[PDB]
Amino acid sequence: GSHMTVREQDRFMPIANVIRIMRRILPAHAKISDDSKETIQECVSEYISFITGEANERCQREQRKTITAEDVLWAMSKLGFDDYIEPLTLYLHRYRE
Amino acid sequence: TQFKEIEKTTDFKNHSLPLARIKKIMKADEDVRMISAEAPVVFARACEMFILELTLRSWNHTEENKRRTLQKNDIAAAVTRTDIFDFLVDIVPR
Numbered sequence: 068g069s070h071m072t073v074r075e076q077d078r079f080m081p082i083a084n085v086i087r088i089m090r091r092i093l094p095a096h097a098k099i100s101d102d103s104k105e106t107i108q109e110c111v112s113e114y115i116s117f118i119t120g121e122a123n124e125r126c127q128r129e130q131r132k133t134i135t136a137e138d139v140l141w142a143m144s145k146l147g148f149d150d151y152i153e154p155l156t157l158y159l160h161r162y163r164e
Numbered sequence: 165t166q167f168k169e170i171e172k173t174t175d176f177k178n179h180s181l182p183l184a185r186i187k188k189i190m191k192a193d194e195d196v197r198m199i200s201a202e203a204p205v206v207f208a209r210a211c212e213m214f215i216l217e218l219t220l221r222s223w224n225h226t227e228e229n230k231r232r233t234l235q236k237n238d239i240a241a242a243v244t245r246t247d248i249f250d251f252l253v254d255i256v257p258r
């Protein structure tokens with residue numbers, strides 16, 4: 068069967084920012100269906116929750132209260148985002164300079 | 165996937181996704197107590213990279229089917245093939 072929910076806008080990235088990124092990697096005259104725009108926007112929030120949960124779980128095991136940038140990169144690596152680590156680490160390191 | 169940064173006049177910052185909205189999405193897990201101000205900064209670039217890769221892998225499936233419109237079943241195919249996207253299979257079943 069089915070039931071209703073409310074899709075709260077403050078629980079997703081603004082659609083415009085998401086769409087603008089999508090078009091940077093697509094050919095000029097490529098089209099994106101409305102469902103696709105919503106779906107990508109939902110996947111983004113799931114991606115944050117997935118990585119945050121892995122990082123937060125370790126903090127609880129270590130009796131720490133604050134999720135650090137390092138916990139995020141550790142969790143991304145533990146979950147297999149190997150191609151992501153070096154660009155985010157250099158971006159993090161320059162951010163700190 | 166080979167990510168690379170494009171240094172570029174016309175960008176105000178090195179990211180374009182709202183840190184405050186990232187923070188609210190992490191806090192919806194009620195087990196999340198405290199978040200360093202640097203963590204959303206990491207996610208703001210990480211989310212851009214994730215959007216680029218998922219869009220590109222979906223578009224590969226689009227082109228394979230001789231279409232010029234990215235459709236939800238293309239996202240579903242990309243999630244099915246890419247091991248690091250397994251966590252999304254319930255979100256995009258087809």
Ligand SMILES: [Ca+2]
Binds near residue numbers: 247248
């Ligand atoms: Ca694998």
